Structure 1
Amino acid sequence: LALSLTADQMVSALLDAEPPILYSEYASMMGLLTNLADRELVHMINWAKRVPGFVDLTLHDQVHLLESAWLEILMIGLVWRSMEHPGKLLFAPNLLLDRNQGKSVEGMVEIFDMLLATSSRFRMMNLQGEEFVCLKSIILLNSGVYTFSTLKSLEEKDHIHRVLDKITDTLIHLMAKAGLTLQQQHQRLAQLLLILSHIRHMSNKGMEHLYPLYDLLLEMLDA
């Protein structure tokens, strides 16, 4: 069980599960981002399976979690790799775009600015890679949890909450190691989890304009 892993073992599992940074393959704009996202999703599915506690869930529940988190997950990766590129979003090393090039779509402008603002927040906070991988894991486990009343669902949520607790402990550990005081540790933990609400929001806004999916992701998880 994921529940007996030490903090160091958890960080180390998450660091080893990290997908690679993918490249763009080249109006053409949405085609290029569509193609990049779809390739990313294949690696995300494999990363998911390596997140401690994830394959303990039913196949149905795994698919639910991925259906609910996949865009937030692409967004937090985007924002992470954009940290060192103020004013720009590094979709791929060969696809670094600004809000002006974001205007080139329909409605994504304001979301572009939101993504840019999250990136600045991370840079400002000096988010570490070890912290980022825990955040990503938290999104995967958390996003779909409150939308799976049977007894089995009740077991599924309890497991997720215990794995989530383990990831909280891991985050606090990293901060402790980094030399922050206890007051700085609770404050930074809160600040990062609050950013996860903003990521949920950007994801919702992203979904409204990019528009079943569950079935598509089921075929993928199977494949």
Structure 2
Amino acid sequence: PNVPELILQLLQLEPDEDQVRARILGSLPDQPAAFGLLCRMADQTFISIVDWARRCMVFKELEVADQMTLLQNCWSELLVFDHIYRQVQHGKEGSILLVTGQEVELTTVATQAGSLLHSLVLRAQELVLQLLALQLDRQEFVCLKFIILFSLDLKFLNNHILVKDAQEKANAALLDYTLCHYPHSGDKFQQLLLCLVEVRALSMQAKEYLYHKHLGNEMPRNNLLIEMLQAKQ
């Protein structure tokens, strides 16, 4: 009941009240996937994730250089995790929900997607299934995405003191909440951390899919995810 205050403050920052979807700007007998538009949609989602991060406690106090490093470290993880949590909210094994409200059957991606994309999607759905079995909730969701945001080793930043505090306070918050709210079997704190390891592994496969598209000149010319890929991580 006594939800940690960090988690409370993070829910208040969470923009979703239908507003993310409205704000997303690709401007609106079945057919091939709308590739360019799907790209656009993902780019705008990245935009909204940076909007989120710049409003976050701790982060908004850091100087721009540190903010950039942190986001350079985690951008693909945040996007994958964004997509994953959308799928736990969806609660359908047979299709994927997109931020636009559009659902894509998994049979569709089986017929159209190449080797790489298909693997990626499927591996992601396994992770969705895992988080559903852990009864993942919105409180845990926002805590976990703050954790991902600050999942960079201190040494890479100017401001150690504040980032260390955020890293420590965020984990403590997750433990406290899972311990109080999931009095069930399994250490849920630890299981969720294991999930984050998988989110990171997925996001690596995602960048490699991206890099594949880029080398074959298949991406839109001014794609934001490609610009993020190409800037020194």
TM score, norm. by length of structure 2: 0.76
CA contact (8 A) 1:19 1:44 kept: no
Alpha-carbon distance between aligned partners in 1 of 2:179 and 2:134, rounded to the nearest angstrom: 16
Unmatched 5+ stretches in structure 2: 212-225
Q: Amino acid of the residue matched to residue 188 of structure 1?
A: K
Deviation at residue 101 of structure 1 after TM alignment: 2.9
Alpha-carbon distance between aligned partners in 2 of 1:9 and 1:38, rounded to the nearest angstrom: 32
Residue 64 of structure 1: which of 45, 65, 69 is its match? 69
Residue 42 of structure 2: which of 34, 37, 58 is its match? 37
Deviation at residue 74 of structure 1 after TM alignment: 1.6
* 2:81 counterpart of 1:85: no
Deviation at residue 43 of structure 1 after TM alignment: 1.9
Alpha-carbon distance between aligned partners in 1 of 2:206 and 2:132, rounded to the nearest angstrom: 23
Structure 1, 87-96 or 120-129: larger mean CA deviation: 87-96
Alpha-carbon distance between aligned partners in 2 of 1:204 and 1:146, rounded to the nearest angstrom: 21
- Which segments of structure 1 move beyond 6 Å, counting only runs of 4 or more? none
CA contact (8 A) 1:79 1:118 kept: yes
Deviation at residue 9 of structure 1 after TM alignment: 2.5
Residue 11 of structure 1: which of 7, 14, 34 is its match? 7
SS state of the match for residue 104, structure 2?
A: strand
Distance change (3 Å), C-alpha of 1:145 and 1:34: farther
Deviation at residue 10 of structure 1 after TM alignment: 1.0
Identity %: 23
* 2:207 counterpart of 1:207: yes
SS state of the match for residue 199, structure 2?
A: helix
Which is helix-richer, 1 or 2?
Answer: 1
Alpha-carbon distance between aligned partners in 1 of 2:53 and 2:61, rounded to the nearest angstrom: 12
Alpha-carbon distance between aligned partners in 2 of 1:59 and 1:9, rounded to the nearest angstrom: 26
CA contact (8 A) 2:150 2:163 kept: yes
- Match in the other structure for 1:135: 144
Distance change (3 Å), C-alpha of 1:157 and 1:101: farther
Distance change (3 Å), C-alpha of 1:146 and 1:209: farther
- Match in the other structure for 1:220: none
* 2:159 counterpart of 1:145: no
Deviation at residue 93 of structure 1 after TM alignment: 5.1
Alpha-carbon distance between aligned partners in 2 of 1:216 and 1:110, rounded to the nearest angstrom: 23
Q: Amino acid of the residue matched to residue 67 of structure 2?
A: Q
Distance change (3 Å), C-alpha of 1:29 and 1:105: farther
Q: Amino acid of the residue matched to residue 137 of structure 1?
A: F
Alpha-carbon distance between aligned partners in 2 of 1:39 and 1:215, rounded to the nearest angstrom: 16
- Match in the other structure for 1:164: 167
Deviation at residue 69 of structure 1 after TM alignment: 1.4
Q: Amino acid of the residue matched to residue 30 of structure 1?
A: F
Alpha-carbon distance between aligned partners in 1 of 2:15 and 2:230, rounded to the nearest angstrom: 21
